[PDB]
Design a protein around this ligand. Structure first.
Ligand SMILES: CCCCCCCCCCCCCC(=O)O
Lengths: 265, 234, 282, 68, 96
């Protein structure tokens, strides 16, 4: 027979194995698919890479300390320089993709703590100034693979234009005014260190359009929260890494133009 | 023309009226639908999703992430771990869960409620917890001895990480008022150690569990009302 | 036929087995599936109750007040500019309607609008004024917009409009779904345009979110009457009732007071829960 | 070309069966041809909570270990 | 290795090659390793991000103590020369 805990995910030129996963989630019960002719918007001849963009990429790792309040990513953004997925989103005006999101975090049996991994469509976050609304720079809004962080202090500045262009990423309100305890409405999986060392979520493209412009819109974001604190009891300050590995799937593009080169720092 | 009489109700405007109005944009060609994943048809489909309970929203925990973490210890205790009043649109700690907020849009509710607890301690630690529900005719199940005379589940912490308790629809009415009243007493929910949590060397002695609440499949609501939770200045 | 009811309960009895409905693994992302027959003995119950009030069509089937407009018909020259009011169409002016809509990420519906008018005298002295008529004109994005209550655009040769005589039943009209997309988005995690490498590093600061992309035009509302010695002030309450509605993605409802059209928070309101005395209080 | 349909029952309706009585009926005529002008639609109690409560690739039964 | 010793009697070879890694730590210890093969050409995978873009497998340490990474036979020829002949560059294998 086969266990539920043990699994192998293969896409493109890459494979991820795991021996401790709580199955896998297919958000809303649907798999990424290619656009059906009957729903297509553009009349351009689409580009459909098979095994170029559709491979797993590993994002820069983050560290889980007992003082972290969480981490976040905008999904298309976190893969913007990732080989061919990166190049195709900049060469084409339009693009669409689903994703396989795999989150990894090791701990020993003497460790405790839990990470909630949530995928939030349209993960819109609040500005960090009380003098303006819906105010955030392109650059701060789209940090890349680095992601961003959550805090537990709301310290807006109604006078400092620079800080006001950063997000007000409160952990308990998920950066947008919603209590985190209701985050569970979104597809999610929990990396409870006494149960799992990983989580996998399959993500369909979800939008009001069949296809959109990737340099403008982040279809989904990734939120990871320390639902339960990390502890080891054999140290004053334990630390374990968290690594997020992502593959686009059933990817297509249209609107070929000169490569887009966004404002950056 | 046809002789008619205008009955009472003529020319009133009713918020909840259902009556055909003329189209503003006649012959408008409406943008065609596409399938969008995640279609919701009923609010109860969301009521059935397990969300966290801010069980520990006490001084120093209120409005911080820690309000969702129920402490557990390897120490001797005869005290309750937590207590909850089973009144989803009243109890301060239950009212803001997804189930609570949906119910804050309704006047009355029925059906069973499920409480799921996830142990987030070490793998090396073990123990047994008693979860229970005691209907309203009871005095508060302050002691384990009172808790064990009601509806209860002994949850063995082990390979499977969580346990679901169901508080059945035991009621002297059909639907209970969502709004707090004295008549529609919710009943009591609590938890005691059945044994104790036993923790080995070099393993943390302070653990947490996360409680969740959701509607059961027999759950429903009666009448729509505005939620008391969100204010507006003028 | 008969509308389908909620789950009935079968009678059950004692259990001693390896089957264990009591345990699960919420780490899987699944909710617990236990129902009373899984953990306690139950009696048979026929359930005839239905989830009709909770259907989305029923949930959203109310005309919410969205905004209030102010019109002033006065002989005083400084009030000419107040004879005419322009409303930027949105549902974000009122918290109950936007909060209900924000349970979902996307939705599609047709919209019923109702206009309720109230007149009074803001002056220190009243007098006779003839019955007034109001014109509500819809100006689509990009369409010509009036500079005054008596400008040329009021001819309404294109823009649809309503002429209402005060005292009659409130006008009511229906607008078919008009989104460019196949659903209205209630959130937009993105920018109106993409600033490039040749631009300012703070670029995009002012064009983020649903606010920068949606434009539903305006309501140009004016009294259509000539000025009289006694000023009349009119309050116009604009109501909306979405109908024939589908929604595609649940979200947590906002827990805190809104600040503007986005998701912005005010620090004075980031504390949504009440305190309790003890974890053990019943 | 009117459409007759069953009414939602009320206080004086003897059966929760909703298939008893020829009187629990109403008639709807669509007067406007633009469909946006039609009155509110019919009740539809179809539900599919599994999309949000059990979106798990590999089916597990509630009586079995959630994790084998 | 036995493969090398057999191939040292030949001038040409072809076919995929498997690399299997056995973890010999404690049972209580856990962790993950990235095993990767890059086709020849370009700069070598001197850091994880570049190794990652190549063919790779993530090995989860557990009861199954041995993970097999396979270097597919990706080549611009039919057979590669056994000798370190620059006309037939091998490709790179790393672990991070
Ligand atoms: C003569 C007055 C008619 C005015 C018609 C305005 C129609 C507005 C359509 C609804 C736009 C709001 C929807 C949204 O923001 O998601």
């Amino acid at each position: 027979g086969y266990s539920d805990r043990v699994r192998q995910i293969t896409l493109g030129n890459s494979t991820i194995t795991t021996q401790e996963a709580a199955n896998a989630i297919v958000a809303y019960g649907e798999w990424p698919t290619y656009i059906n002719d009957s729903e297509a918007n553009p009349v351009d001849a689409p580009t459909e890479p098979d095994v170029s963009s559709n491979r797993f990429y590993t994002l820069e790792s983050v560290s889980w300390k007992t003082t972290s309040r969480g981490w976040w990513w905008k999904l298309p953004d976190c893969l913007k320089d990732m080989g061919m997925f990166g190049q195709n989103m900049y060469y084409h005006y339009l693009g669409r993709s689903g994703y396989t999101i795999h989150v990894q975090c090791n701990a020993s049996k003497f460790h405790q703590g839990a990470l909630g991994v949530f995928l939030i469509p349209e993960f819109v976050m609040a500005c960090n100034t009380e003098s303006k609304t819906s105010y955030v720079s392109y650059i701060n809004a789209n940090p890349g693979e680095r992601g961003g962080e959550f805090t537990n202090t709301y310290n807006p500045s109604n006078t400092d234009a620079s800080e006001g262009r950063k997000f007000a990423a409160l952990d308990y309100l998920l950066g947008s005014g919603v209590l985190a305890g209701n985050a569970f409405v979104y597809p999610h999986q929990i990396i409870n260190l006494r149960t799992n060392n990983s989580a996998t979520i399959v993500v369909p493209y979800v939008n009001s359009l069949v296809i959109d412009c990737m340099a403008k819109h982040n279809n989904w974001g990734i939120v990871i929260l320390p639902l339960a604190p990390l502890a080891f009891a054999a140290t004053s300050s334990p630390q374990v890494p968290i690594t997020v590995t992502i593959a686009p799937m059933c990817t297509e593009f249209n609107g070929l133009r000169n490569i887009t080169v966004p404002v950056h720092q | 023309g046809l002789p008619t009489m205008n009955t009472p109700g003529s020319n009133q405007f009713l918020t909840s009226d259902d009556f055909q109005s003329p189209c503003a944009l006649p012959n408008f060609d409406v943008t065609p639908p596409i399938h969008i994943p995640g279609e919701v048809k009923n609010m109860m489909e969301l009521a059935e999703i397990d969300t966290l309970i801010p069980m520990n929203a006490v001084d120093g925990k209120v409005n911080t992430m820690e309000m969702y973490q129920i402490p557990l210890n390897d120490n001797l205790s005869k005290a309750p771990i937590f207590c909850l009043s089973l009144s989803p649109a009243s109890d301060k700690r239950l009212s803001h869960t997804m189930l609570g907020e949906i119910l804050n849009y309704y006047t009355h509710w029925t059906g069973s409620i499920r409480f799921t607890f996830l142990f987030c301690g070490s793998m090396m630690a073990t123990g047994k917890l008693l979860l229970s529900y005691s209907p309203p005719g009871a005095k508060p199940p302050t002691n384990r001895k009172d808790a064990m005379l009601g509806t209860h589940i002994i949850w063995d912490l082990g390979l499977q990480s969580s346990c679901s308790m169901v508080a059945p629809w035991i009621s002297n009415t059909v639907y209970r008022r969502c709004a707090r009243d004295d008549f529609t007493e919710g009943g009591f929910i609590t938890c005691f150690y059945q044994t104790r949590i036993v923790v080995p060397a070099s393993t943390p002695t302070s653990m947490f569990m996360l409680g969740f609440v959701s509607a059961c499949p027999d759950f429903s609501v009666r009448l729509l009302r505005d939620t008391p939770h969100i204010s507006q200045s003028k | 036929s008969q509308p389908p009811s909620t789950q009935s309960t079968e009678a059950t009895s004692g259990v001693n087995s390896q089957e264990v409905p009591a345990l699960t693994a919420v780490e899987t992302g699944a909710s617990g599936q236990a129902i009373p027959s899984d953990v306690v003995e139950t009696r048979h119950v026929v359930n005839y109750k239905t989830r009709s009030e909770s259907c989305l069509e029923s949930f959203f089937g109310r005309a919410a007040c969205v905004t209030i407009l102010s019109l002033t018909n006065s002989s005083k020259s400084g009030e000419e500019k107040k004879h005419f009011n322009i409303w930027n169409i949105t549902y974000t002016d009122t918290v109950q309607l936007r909060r209900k809509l924000e349970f979902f990420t996307y939705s599609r519906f047709d919209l019923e609008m109702t206009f309720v008018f109230t007149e009074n005298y803001p002056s220190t002295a009243s007098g006779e004024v003839r019955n007034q008529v109001y014109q509500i004109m819809y100006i689509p994005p990009g369409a010509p917009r009036p500079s005054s209550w008596d400008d040329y655009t009021w001819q309404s040769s294109s823009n649809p409009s309503i002429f209402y005589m005060y005292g009659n039943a409130p006008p009511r009209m229906s607008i078919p779904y008009v989104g460019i997309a196949n659903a209205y988005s209630h959130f937009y995690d993105g920018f109106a345009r993409v600033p490039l490498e040749g631009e300012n590093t703070d670029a995009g600061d002012t064009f983020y979110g649903l606010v920068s992309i949606n434009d539903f035009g305006v309501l140009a509302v004016r009294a259509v009457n000539r000025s009289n010695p006694h000023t009349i002030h009119t309050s116009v309450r604009v109501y909306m009732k979405p109908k024939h509605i589908r929604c595609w993605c649940p979200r947590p409802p906002r827990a805190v007071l809104y600040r503007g059209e986005g998701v912005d928070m005010i620090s004075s309101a980031i504390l949504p829960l009440a305190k309790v005395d003890s974890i053990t209080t019943f | 070309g009117a459409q007759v349909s069953t009414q939602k029952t009320g206080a004086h309706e003897n059966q929760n069966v909703a298939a008893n009585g020829s009187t629990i009926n109403y008639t709807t005529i669509n007067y406007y041809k633009d469909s946006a002008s039609n009155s509110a639609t019919r009740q539809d109690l179809s539900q599919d909570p599994s999309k949000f409560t059990e979106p798990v690739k590999d089916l597990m039964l509630k009586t079995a270990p959630a994790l084998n």
